[PDB]
Amino acid sequence: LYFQSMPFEFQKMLIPEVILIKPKVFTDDRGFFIETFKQSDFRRHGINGEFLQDNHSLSMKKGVLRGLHYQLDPHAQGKLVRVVLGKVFDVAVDLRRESPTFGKWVSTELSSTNNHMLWIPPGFAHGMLVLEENTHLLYKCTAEYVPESERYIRWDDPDINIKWPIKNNLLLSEKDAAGVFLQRAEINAQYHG
Amino acid sequence: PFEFQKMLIPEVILIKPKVFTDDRGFFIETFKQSDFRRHGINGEFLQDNHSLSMKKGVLRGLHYQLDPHAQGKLVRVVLGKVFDVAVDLRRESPTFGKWVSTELSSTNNHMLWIPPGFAHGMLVLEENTHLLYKCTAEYVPESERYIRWDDPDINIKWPIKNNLLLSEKDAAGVFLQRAEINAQYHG
Ligand SMILES: Cc1cn([C@H]2C[C@H](O)[C@@H](COP(=O)(O)OP(=O)(O)O)O2)c(=O)[nH]c1=O
Ligand SMILES: Cc1cn([C@H]2C[C@H](O)[C@@H](COP(=O)(O)OP(=O)(O)O)O2)c(=O)[nH]c1=O
Ligand SMILES: Cc1cn([C@H]2C[C@H](O)[C@@H](COP(=O)(O)OP(=O)(O)O)O2)c(=O)[nH]c1=O
Ligand SMILES: Cc1cn([C@H]2C[C@H](O)[C@@H](COP(=O)(O)OP(=O)(O)O)O2)c(=O)[nH]c1=O
């Protein structure tokens, strides 16, 4: 019972390079149809670069946390993130050296209920906390996977100080559990504007 | 990370991605330009769509856009299952009016490449089926054309013919012999 006239709403977050996208849901007797991406519209609202790789993660239990992740330059991925089933608390962290918002973060709830999408530009790290069982997270990347370039910052880093709605149990990968603290992170991304 | 398999109409390509399981669940790379372009799948993906079909027996198709708005489509099912159909509607094609089908599901995570020049149809086999597809051209409603699912010249073997939920546009699809088609065979 939430109505939007236009096919996409684009909303800049407090870190304005991060963009929350609300697509339009067309309901009928069959079910629904959503346009989830449209280059022409996205490019007019600041979202640039060729999407070279799409990924899909299933997280079976509430409390799965993945992040914080980025690829070193020149393999930095811009990401368009959505949840087709379930719900996540989704986080973008500005890790662009010299950025007036370096080490700051914004969050949004991405779910199969809202069908919201988050644009996380290159220069940022991504983290997500699973809030519903069997959560399917899909994202498009502006650069292809380069495992050697992947870096890992721990979820509970105190300088970043993300307010995770951690309810009870936390399921972490070994790489994420072994995430480093921001102060000893390897970062080459540079702020431009 | 991907197996690519040409169908009997060899421009139609079945893609089997690799599933990495762990304690958290799984990870799949569902598209990768470098790999896809090496295996014949070309064109910029300009638009992504998502359809939910609540009941078994929802049928959508048969759909294409006239040139110059023809969409190549990369089709997958993230939840549920469809009987997915590609129909060759390229004038002068040795397989004009022929079709290939595959089962796309959340169990197999298979994907189908349906090149421009083809029509797409899908029949929903599990409740709450989520079909996702990437298009090589943006939506142009004026260019959309609709061919009846049960057209007798195309003669698709749909695994269900009865409890069928159709859109009004699909119900009103035209028969192949009176279809508007401008796509041309080059291959
Ligand atoms: C709420 C919020 C905090 N933050 C950062 C700013 C601060 O470093 C920290 C806020 O938590 P806290 O240290 O408790 O607040 P304060 O610094 O105002 O005493 O987290 C964000 O980057 N984004 C947000 O949305
Ligand atoms: C991020 C990523 C991972 N993988 C593989 C490597 C591992 O086997 C598995 C999980 O990787 P992992 O780095 O744990 O993913 P997450 O970002 O969710 O923590 O997926 C790819 O094949 N491609 C990708 O782009
Ligand atoms: C089985 C199959 C049939 N077809 C075509 C061939 C026929 O024109 C029609 C099915 O008819 P069919 O009963 O297979 O052959 P016939 O009628 O010649 O005895 O659909 C395809 O295009 N793809 C397929 O995978
Ligand atoms: C195919 C398509 C449909 N729509 C809208 C128009 C209708 O309100 C709704 C369903 O269109 P419809 O043509 O019935 O979809 P399907 O191909 O599944 O039969 O979605 C778009 O906004 N973009 C698209 O690319």
Side-chain angles (χ1 to χ4, degrees):
Chain A
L1 299 177
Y2 260 81
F3 167 63
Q4 168 187 321
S5 50
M6 292 324 144
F8 300 105
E9 296 189 343
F10 299 90
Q11 180 201 124
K12 315 200 290 167
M13 300 295 275
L14 278 167
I15 306 172
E17 296 97 338
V18 181
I19 303 171
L20 178 65
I21 306 113
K22 314 187 191 213
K24 189 170 181 167
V25 184
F26 293 94
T27 289
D28 68 10
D29 276 344
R30 295 169 306 168
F32 68 64
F33 198 98
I34 313 172
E35 297 187 335
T36 63
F37 172 70
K38 195 154 158 318
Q39 189 191 77
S40 67
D41 303 44
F42 276 53
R43 279 183 181 187
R44 278 198 315 274
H45 295 255
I47 304 169
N48 276 305
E50 248 205 297
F51 292 97
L52 301 180
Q53 179 171 340
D54 300 346
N55 297 320
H56 172 190
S57 67
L58 167 70
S59 297
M60 287 181 286
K61 282 298 165 164
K62 300 150 89 140
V64 167
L65 195 154
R66 316 182 181 243
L68 299 167
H69 301 158
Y70 59 104
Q71 288 187 168
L72 290 177
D73 292 9
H75 310 303
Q77 303 172 308
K79 299 175 192 168
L80 281 175
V81 184
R82 76 216 201 238
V83 171
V84 292
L85 181 67
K87 191 193 299 297
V88 310
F89 172 93
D90 204 62
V91 183
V93 180
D94 187 351
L95 295 180
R96 292 173 300 170
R97 291 214 176 285
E98 302 303 307
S99 162
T101 53
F102 179 82
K104 304 305 215 302
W105 57 271
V106 298
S107 72
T108 202
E109 183 184 292
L110 303 172
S111 80
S112 56
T113 294
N114 61 30
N115 299 291
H116 289 173
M117 313 184 283
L118 194 68
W119 167 241
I120 307 172
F124 291 61
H126 183 217
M128 58 89 108
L129 170 71
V130 177
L131 300 186
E132 289 173 4
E133 62 188 23
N134 296 316
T135 289
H136 291 265
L137 185 130
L138 307 186
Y139 68 107
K140 303 156 62 70
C141 304
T142 62
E144 296 194 6
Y145 178 51
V146 181
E148 320 84 76
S149 78
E150 281 185 310
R151 297 293 184 276
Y152 302 81
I153 294 169
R154 50 200 300 107
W155 84 96
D156 63 0
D157 182 82
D159 295 334
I160 300 169
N161 188 36
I162 297 159
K163 310 305 185 155
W164 295 104
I166 294 172
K167 221 169 48 141
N168 47 83
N169 209 25
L170 221 58
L171 179 50
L172 289 145
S173 82
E174 297 149 64
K175 278 177 315 164
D176 284 352
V180 310
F181 283 95
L182 174 58
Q183 228 149 247
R184 46 151 172 162
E186 189 186 355
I187 297 171
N188 60 359
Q190 292 295 315
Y191 184 71
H192 296 302
Chain B
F2 303 105
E3 359 190 14
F4 299 87
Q5 174 191 333
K6 315 202 286 158
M7 300 297 275
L8 277 170
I9 306 171
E11 296 95 342
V12 182
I13 302 172
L14 177 66
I15 306 112
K16 314 187 188 222
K18 191 169 180 196
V19 185
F20 296 93
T21 66
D22 68 14
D23 210 63
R24 296 169 303 170
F26 67 67
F27 200 97
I28 312 172
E29 307 185 330
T30 63
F31 171 70
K32 194 172 196 167
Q33 188 188 81
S34 64
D35 301 44
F36 276 52
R37 288 199 174 176
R38 278 198 317 275
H39 294 255
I41 304 170
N42 285 128
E44 248 212 288
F45 292 97
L46 299 181
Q47 178 169 346
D48 300 346
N49 297 319
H50 172 188
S51 64
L52 165 73
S53 297
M54 291 172 297
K55 281 152 155 183
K56 306 154 162 218
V58 166
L59 195 157
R60 317 179 180 245
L62 299 169
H63 299 161
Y64 58 103
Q65 286 187 171
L66 289 177
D67 291 9
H69 310 303
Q71 301 173 309
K73 300 176 191 171
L74 280 176
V75 184
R76 77 197 191 263
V77 171
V78 69
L79 296 153
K81 191 190 292 193
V82 310
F83 174 89
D84 204 61
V85 184
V87 180
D88 186 351
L89 294 180
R90 293 172 301 169
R91 292 152 63 120
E92 304 312 317
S93 163
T95 53
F96 179 83
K98 305 300 161 62
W99 56 271
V100 300
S101 71
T102 199
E103 184 178 290
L104 303 171
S105 82
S106 55
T107 304
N108 61 30
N109 299 291
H110 288 174
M111 313 184 283
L112 194 69
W113 166 241
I114 306 170
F118 291 64
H120 184 218
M122 58 88 107
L123 170 71
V124 177
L125 300 185
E126 289 173 3
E127 61 172 10
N128 294 318
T129 288
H130 292 264
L131 186 132
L132 310 181
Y133 68 106
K134 302 156 61 72
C135 304
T136 64
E138 297 194 3
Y139 176 52
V140 181
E142 321 84 75
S143 77
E144 281 184 311
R145 295 295 182 274
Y146 302 82
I147 295 172
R148 207 77 65 75
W149 59 284
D150 62 355
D151 184 81
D153 300 329
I154 299 166
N155 189 34
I156 298 160
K157 305 310 227 297
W158 294 105
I160 310 165
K161 258 97 173 190
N162 315 294
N163 40 88
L164 244 56
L165 180 49
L166 287 144
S167 80
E168 300 170 21
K169 281 187 286 101
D170 283 352
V174 308
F175 285 108
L176 174 59
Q177 46 190 290
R178 318 216 144 64
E180 191 182 356
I181 296 170
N182 55 7
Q184 287 288 321
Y185 184 72
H186 296 118

